[PDB]
Amino acid sequence: DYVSIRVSTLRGDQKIDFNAYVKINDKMILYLRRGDSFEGERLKRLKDKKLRKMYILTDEENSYRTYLQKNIETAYDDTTGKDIQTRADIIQGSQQNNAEEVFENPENVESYNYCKDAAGKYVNFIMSNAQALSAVMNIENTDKTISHHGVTVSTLSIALAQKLGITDPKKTQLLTLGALLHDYGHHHSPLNLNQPLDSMSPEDLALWKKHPIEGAQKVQDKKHFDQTVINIIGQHEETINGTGPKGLREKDMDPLAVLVSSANAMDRLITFEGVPKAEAAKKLMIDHVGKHPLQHIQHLNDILKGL
Ligand SMILES: [Fe+3]
Ligand SMILES: [Fe+3]
Incomplete structure (x- = not known):
């Protein structure tokens, strides 16, 4: 049903096209929403939560991989300024x-x-x-x-x-x-x-x-x-x-x-x-x-x- 992802992968201004859940007391709570991004002070706000892992629905994992892939492709690009x-x-x-x-x-x-x-x-x-x-x-x-x-x-x-x-x-x-x-x-x-x-x-x-x-x-x-x-x-x-x-x-x-x-x-x-x-x-x-x-x-x- 769910797969875990590491919080360090949620970075930058790209809008996510998946929801993400926190697990507390063995239940999943929708915390990050489709359209969210993590640029600026949002990085620290999420990080202050001291979470290592969040979870995504298995049917959105392709969306998460695509998100990851675009994040890296664009971040390492020295031509975009x-x-x-x-x-x-x-x-x-x-x-x-x-x-x-x-x-x-x-x-x-x-x-x-x-x-x-x-x-x-x-x-x-x-x-x-x-x-x-x-x-x-x-x-x-x-x-x-x-x-x-x-x-x-x-x-x-x-x-x-x-x-x-x-x-x-x-x-x-x-x-x-x-x-x-x-x-x-x-x-x-x-x-x-x-x-x-x-x-x-x-x-x-x-x-x-x-x-x-x-x-x-x-x-x-x-x-x-x-x-x-x-x-x-x-x-x-x-x-x-x-x-x-x-x-x-x-x-x-x-x-x-x-x-x-x-x-x-x-x-x-x-x-x-x-x-x-x-x-x-x-x-x-x-x-x-x-x-x-x-x-x-x-x-x-x-x-x-x-x-
Ligand atoms: Fe050391
Ligand atoms: Fe050491």
Whole structure:
């Protein structure tokens, strides 16, 4: 009768040609209506509801797929001059949805390859559109999900790669894909990520320390997983002074994981530890001295300042 859809796919100004329902106490309530769109403040209004999933009637699923398809086709289009925030709204949510799909179906080769293809599209979107990164950074991760957080980290990672002169398209795609999926270890975890690491109890911190190894272990034997992605999942918490969960130093790591580690540290502060964007870089330089290459943090500082 119903099929679920992820809320991150409801974005932009395209009018939906289906209704969507919320499930509460095992009943379906018509909440979004044919003709609705989600541009501007509506994104936050729906998002403030803290819903992950909504439902659509099976006889309208073709309408939903067509909606999705047009959203992506138009959002990635660099020729239309469509408002950059609307493009970013759609693309951010699509990347997020893609990551969720992989988290939920890690054995699904097709889901992984779709996400991988989309990660390459994301690189080009971010690098080609001057204001795309700032537009994406405007989309607050209010529900603190690892998928949204993956998108943010991948966004910063792309910009950092650009600053570092990393130009290989295969590397940037894999860096982005790994950043997207980096926190797979937290999937379905009972840990509340939305607290400072310095505030976690011994039990929460122990649980937290396992996530790179567990995330990596869960995908490392999957033949469709790229090694770069496995590396980033497993190594992204390592710091260059060997103070991360595994105690790896820079010399031990995939250089692309060192990059994601830097980008992640920034969003952890911003999204999970309540540090304002404009204070995060400085926070890392002083209170996280020596954990990440200073140059990475300086670049990230400039990235947030638009320099
Ligand atoms: Fe992590
Ligand atoms: Fe993370």
